[PDB]
Amino acid sequence: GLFGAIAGFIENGWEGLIDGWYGFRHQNAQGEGTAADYKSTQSAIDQITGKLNRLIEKTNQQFELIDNEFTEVEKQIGNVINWTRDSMTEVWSYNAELLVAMENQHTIDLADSEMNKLYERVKRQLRENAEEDGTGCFEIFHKCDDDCMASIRNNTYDHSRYREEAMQNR
Amino acid sequence: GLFGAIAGFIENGWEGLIDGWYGFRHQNAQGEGTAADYKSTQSAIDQITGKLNRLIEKTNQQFELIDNEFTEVEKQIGNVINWTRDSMTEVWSYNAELLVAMENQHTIDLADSEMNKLYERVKRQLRENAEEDGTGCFEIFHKCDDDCMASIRNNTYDHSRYREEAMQNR
Amino acid sequence: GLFGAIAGFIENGWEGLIDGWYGFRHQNAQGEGTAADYKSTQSAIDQITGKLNRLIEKTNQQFELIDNEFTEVEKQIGNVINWTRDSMTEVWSYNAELLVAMENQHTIDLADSEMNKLYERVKRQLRENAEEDGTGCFEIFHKCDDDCMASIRNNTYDHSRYREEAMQNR
Amino acid sequence: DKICLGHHAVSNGTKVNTLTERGVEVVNATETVERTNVPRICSKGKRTVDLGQCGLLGTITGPPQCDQFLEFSADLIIERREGSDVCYPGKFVNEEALRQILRESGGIDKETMGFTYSGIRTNGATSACRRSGSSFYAEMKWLLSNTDNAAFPQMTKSYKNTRKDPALIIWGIHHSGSTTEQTKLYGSGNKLITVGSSNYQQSFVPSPGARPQVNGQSGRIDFHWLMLNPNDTVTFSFNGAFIAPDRASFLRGKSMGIQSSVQVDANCEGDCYHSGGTIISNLPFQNINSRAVGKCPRYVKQESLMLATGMKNVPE
Amino acid sequence: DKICLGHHAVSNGTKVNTLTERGVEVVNATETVERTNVPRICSKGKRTVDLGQCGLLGTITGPPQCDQFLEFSADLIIERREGSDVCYPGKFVNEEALRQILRESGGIDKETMGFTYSGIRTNGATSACRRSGSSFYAEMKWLLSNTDNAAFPQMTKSYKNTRKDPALIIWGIHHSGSTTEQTKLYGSGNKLITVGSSNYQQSFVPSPGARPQVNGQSGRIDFHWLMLNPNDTVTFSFNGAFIAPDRASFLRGKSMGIQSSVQVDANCEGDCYHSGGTIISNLPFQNINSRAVGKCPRYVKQESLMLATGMKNVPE
Amino acid sequence: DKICLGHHAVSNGTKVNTLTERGVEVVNATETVERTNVPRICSKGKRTVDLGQCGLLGTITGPPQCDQFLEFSADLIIERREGSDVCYPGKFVNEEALRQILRESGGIDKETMGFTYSGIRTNGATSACRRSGSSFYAEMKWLLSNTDNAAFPQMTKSYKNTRKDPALIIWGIHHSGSTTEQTKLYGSGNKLITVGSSNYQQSFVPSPGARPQVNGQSGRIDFHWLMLNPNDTVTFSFNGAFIAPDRASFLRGKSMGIQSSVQVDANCEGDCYHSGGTIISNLPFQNINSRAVGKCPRYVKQESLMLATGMKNVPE
């Protein structure tokens, strides 16, 4: 991807995360736990959904027969028709290949972007109370229990409360 | 957007900013003030301008009449002509829809990118003298008056001067 | 670019870097040196290579003559043929222009992205032992010799070893 | 002590292509090219006419196999390979143009031409057109001399389209299997048939001669047609060898015409048809039949083009 | 104490569509599809010929309404619905091909065929072609027997194109309203007209008979044409019923031909024309008329496709 | 003390265009539009037939210049500007359709029609068809009355295609330079030629008259053709003026036909051909010839469209 998170600094995904697209996995004195992020997951899903709504349709444009499979049309007009149809086949096959390749590049980068954004949101929440590991993890210096973890996830975390401790524990 | 700034960590835009596209709003002992950033604004405007120069034209390709609205051409050739024109209408309607949708995605991401870049430029200027709020704001620990603010905007700010104070004021 | 590194916060490229696309240039008591990064270079090259493999081909779609350069076909059918061919010329000239412009935008942003990613990887390696300059440079507080530099390049650098010193040398 | 951000992944991803790469595996994907055909003409909710043994052009002239289709009404018209337009052998000039007109016609309504005759026979028949004994095209009259070898009088007949819509007019030129046979039917001499309207002018001289026997006959009939505009008049001046229209045809409205080898099915609905059936799909592309008609996904050469609907799959 | 980065926004944004989303509001946007028509033919700076009552093909033969258009010169040629190519009723074979040739011709220059005649009358006229009394096609001669019922002598006339460019040659076959009328004009017998060049060969036998009266006449004239290449010779062998060309036509250069119902306007310039007028625009697409000609924006089905020219609008 | 990240750059970059910008310089780029033509027909590995002075349609009838091409076999067929289909002047009806059939034919195989004759001459010849003395089309027979002015007997000849593939059948109608000349060859009267199969019906009456001399002749031959389906029978009923087929033609398989002014070259291979030669390229687009045929890059109007293959070039 363009944002270097998915298949980037995050080494791999989690099969156990069955609840969403992006999520949190923590480590504290109480043990290890995992949870899905609703907002990030929803933003990616809604955008992919929007692509499908645009792409998955056909036109209300009617075409009729201009040649004949039972008794052949005159050769000259028939060859013009076939040349024209073949040309259209060439244009549409090109359009379809390019459409799908382009959408797929964007779709993959879109998911990578949403991951990076979540990562940065947490980073900004934590201030001087944590430091980046580099593998997609934030080492927190002060003690952080399941409420403290839940507050990080719910974006209700108050950095100033634990600031003195983590600042000293640097 | 892909860069999560516009309609992202910056909660909303400013109607009062009538002077440019991106800008600074400060808070110091002297009060509150606002100013437009020329370089960021210009970079976005020039890129949008370039898209319009490419798109807003029609070809120097001449087409002539091949059928007739006053006395109808022969039915068989007429139906071939109509089938061909309708096919072209289908190709161009698809091209136009896709062109505009794709340009618009890129245009929106382009503006988001330019905002993020400005944000990061300021961050790097400030070093250890400030900390990120998370709402698109930099809390500065040392006293910063309207010259100090103007220096940040003009990119003439010397972090080393105020380093000792802000470092202690952490 | 969208990531603001190339032709962005990095002021210019290096002509002397003939060994790769992205690289490191250091400054220590031992002097100055320069080296290419293999992974970043390879990732960009493989992606550009993939674009060429997709684009550089023509179809296995055969077209035959439908008109005649030696003895002219009948005027009416001839004008229909010319109108159709000219229409196809218009579609393909548009497709080609748009394909190349779009690929080029993406190609340029792709290279900018790979640079930004490398920059961020190093930043995360260094932790509290360095600080961003803003010109694409990391000021390291502790003494860092050619092994220490080589470890940064090879991603074998242990920040904890020099942490105490640089933390104090802030 | 710490918290880690991540994303989901699966054991079995799906390969897709991108701008830079072939076969990148993603968490999920979905097909954009339709390959599933329904082997029936899905005609639910549509007034459908399956012509079977009746050829489309025969609905205008009326050979015995088209007796039930002389005045049909339709949204969807189905032609079949076994369809024949003729009983007594012959063909139409500008035949495919006329088929295209009839396919989108909505069907046809018939009205008398008002032609009456004296000094000639009016009831020519043949073993090639069977209706419990020898007969002829239901909508036409085989005009003949009163008796063997008698001179056919120079005749003029005119019809004025008094309707709001154009009238489809058809006539026939009869080419006997020999010159003697022509004289026997219409008297000797080189006969002439003239036809003109206010925007149409043409003439016809027959041409007797031995053809190979078709439906037991070495003769042929040339069928010809024209659209007669509202208030326009058509005049037929003829000296023999002329197959007279008994009725004019009018188009009913709008329809779509298809050619097919499969059965009609009123249990499924679809708007994209081809000879092998119906393409029912919301997908933008199809790889089933490049000659599909109606409202169709675009035909493309690729069997498959997968669209990613998830992130890149990165398993451990 | 602090400094905040931000971006502008507005009260009333404009909706646009993206790859992922319909109706996203942006700070500003601009239309890519042209909907504004100018209801005039914008002909500023162009040599324009508005044919009015003269039909394009009549510029070659010369019925009275085309008297002022026999040798016109043009960049832009305008055909009108009221235009008629004929005075004495008839039509051209390969008529639309000839119109397409004349539309891009730049206009026409006329030159005598050099034909002279003996043993026949040369001045056939009719009440259908009025020039203060009965007259005929200005560029043609109605060739007749010297007196009622006299045999028309078997004739041969040849013309050699000595010019650098191909010559447009036209002739006519006259179909009288009856056989008696044909004999009266050109003597009895089945007349023959032969025409050949070095790359063209065809023959014509007339066909008298009663048509419906058009411009007071039950007769018709078949007009025919051919392009005679430089140094090529055309020969006319004919026995009557023949309308002789008096002059050959040469194409002047390049032009564009249009059909329209609106007035010419020399106050506006435009290069994209249709029957309702002129599309003046720099936009790449138009939703006005799919049959527009000249140098035009591409026709599309959408009424509107807005292109974002600003960031996403995020008001408080 | 410090470490700096950077990227490479060069002195001389290459300009490319983007969505937002024209002429952005990048480290490297590569062309997508082919401009290099090879001025030869690159025919390596292909069975090639260069018709030279033989016209494609002459391979069916056999004027002297086509004597070596009566039964050719080919993957690639080359027509030349100097090619002529005729010796005795004339032309084919539906000529371009027949050329298109022959171009993709794979070549032709010939078989006798099995026609034998009594009561007439069979060996008409002319100085226009030279084979060490006067001769005629190798595949045809000029059928004549036994002696000057003698009546040509009403004749019938039939041929049944007993093969698995359709048969190409050709015949000719002879138009003498005068009526006296026609009577001398085939006796007096208005001759008739009838031709019918089970899906084809048409008739022909000749038309003598003075044409301009071509290859020393004022006469012409109308050549006509039809595809006779497996098990179908064609019957020729004729009274004179008829050029009889001696042999039927069968198509061998598949080929591609081109028109060119350049020499064949068996040292290069290519699949995209035009009159000026061969376009050898893997690039997706070409600006060389919009009428190129075979398997070709797409024709576009732009001379050049550079694709970036490196980052933006930012020198000091």
Ligand SMILES: CC(=O)N[C@H]1[C@H]([C@H](O)[C@H](O)CO)O[C@@](OC[C@H]2O[C@@H](O)[C@H](O)[C@@H](O)[C@H]2O)(C(=O)O)C[C@@H]1O
């Ligand atoms: C109007 C008329 O004359 N009808 C005849 C018809 C025509 O004369 C003829 O078709 C014109 O070409 O001929 C009919 O007999 C011909 C046909 O009869 C079969 O029974 C027989 O097996 C055949 O070999 C042949 O003789 C006809 O049936 O069409 C009689 C009809 O009344």
Ligand SMILES: CC(=O)N[C@H]1[C@H]([C@H](O)[C@H](O)CO)O[C@@](OC[C@H]2O[C@@H](O)[C@H](O)[C@@H](O)[C@H]2O)(C(=O)O)C[C@@H]1O
């Ligand atoms: C060359 C010639 O003979 N001109 C005649 C012309 C032709 O004979 C005729 O058009 C060939 O079809 O006929 C003209 O009279 C016919 C016409 O005259 C009207 O006045 C009258 O109202 C009509 O009913 C009809 O009789 C003609 O005007 O064309 C005379 C012309 O001199």
Ligand SMILES: CC(=O)N[C@H]1[C@H]([C@H](O)[C@H](O)CO)O[C@@](OC[C@H]2O[C@@H](O)[C@H](O)[C@@H](O)[C@H]2O)(C(=O)O)C[C@@H]1O
């Ligand atoms: C079958 C036959 O009659 N062949 C004649 C031929 C035909 O009569 C004629 O081509 C039909 O239109 O005419 C030939 O002589 C005509 C030709 O002879 C030249 O030598 C002379 O220079 C010419 O002016 C002209 O007289 C012919 O050569 O075609 C004789 C041939 O046997």
Ligand SMILES: *[C@@H]1O[C@H](CO)[C@@H](O[C@@H]2O[C@H](CO)[C@@H](O)[C@H](O)[C@H]2NC(C)=O)[C@H](O)[C@H]1NC(C)=O
């Ligand atoms: C135009 O293309 C069609 C196929 O799309 C050709 O018709 C096919 O011909 C092949 C070989 O003769 C047959 O096996 C198929 O049955 C035909 N398919 C269909 C759908 O008809 C057709 O011959 C081409 N037209 C011309 C004028 O050459």
Ligand SMILES: *[C@@H]1O[C@H](CO)[C@@H](O[C@@H]2O[C@H](CO)[C@@H](O)[C@H](O)[C@H]2NC(C)=O)[C@H](O)[C@H]1NC(C)=O
């Ligand atoms: C091809 O399409 C044109 C329209 O684009 C058809 O012409 C229209 O026909 C309708 C119904 O008869 C009329 O109301 C319009 O006035 C016509 N429009 C124009 C611009 O001519 C035309 O009939 C179609 N061609 C054939 C051969 O069917």
Ligand SMILES: *[C@@H]1O[C@H](CO)[C@@H](O[C@@H]2O[C@H](CO)[C@@H](O)[C@H](O)[C@H]2NC(C)=O)[C@H](O)[C@H]1NC(C)=O
């Ligand atoms: C269709 O276009 C072709 C060109 O693509 C026209 O043919 C050219 O005509 C010009 C001017 O007469 C000549 O100088 C060229 O030699 C021709 N080029 C080729 C490749 O033949 C052609 O006339 C147009 N067709 C019709 C029917 O007008």
Ligand SMILES: *[C@@H]1O[C@H](CO)[C@@H](O)[C@H](O)[C@H]1NC(C)=O
């Ligand atoms: C994956 O995509 C398919 C469409 O091809 C769909 O049926 C399915 O619901 C998707 N699976 C999940 C888990 O979303």
Ligand SMILES: *[C@@H]1O[C@H](CO)[C@@H](O)[C@H](O)[C@H]1NC(C)=O
């Ligand atoms: C046809 O003629 C009738 C008069 O009987 C008239 O009402 C109608 O307007 C005419 N229609 C046209 C198109 O001229």
Ligand SMILES: *[C@@H]1O[C@H](CO)[C@@H](O)[C@H](O)[C@H]1NC(C)=O
């Ligand atoms: C917004 O776009 C329109 C074009 O549709 C333009 O006329 C106008 O100048 C733009 N407004 C501003 C404030 O730039």
Ligand SMILES: *[C@@H]1O[C@H](CO)[C@@H](O)[C@H](O)[C@H]1NC(C)=O
């Ligand atoms: C036409 O003939 C003249 C001789 O009068 C000659 O100058 C010219 O070259 C010829 N043109 C062509 C195309 O043969």
Ligand SMILES: *[C@@H]1O[C@H](CO)[C@@H](O)[C@H](O)[C@H]1NC(C)=O
């Ligand atoms: C630059 O691109 C060209 C293709 O146009 C290629 O021949 C060359 O190898 C490339 N140069 C480098 C240094 O990669």
Ligand SMILES: *[C@@H]1O[C@H](CO)[C@@H](O)[C@H](O)[C@H]1NC(C)=O
């Ligand atoms: C042609 O006739 C032969 C009988 O001689 C037969 O074997 C073959 O099936 C027939 N072919 C067709 C297509 O009817």
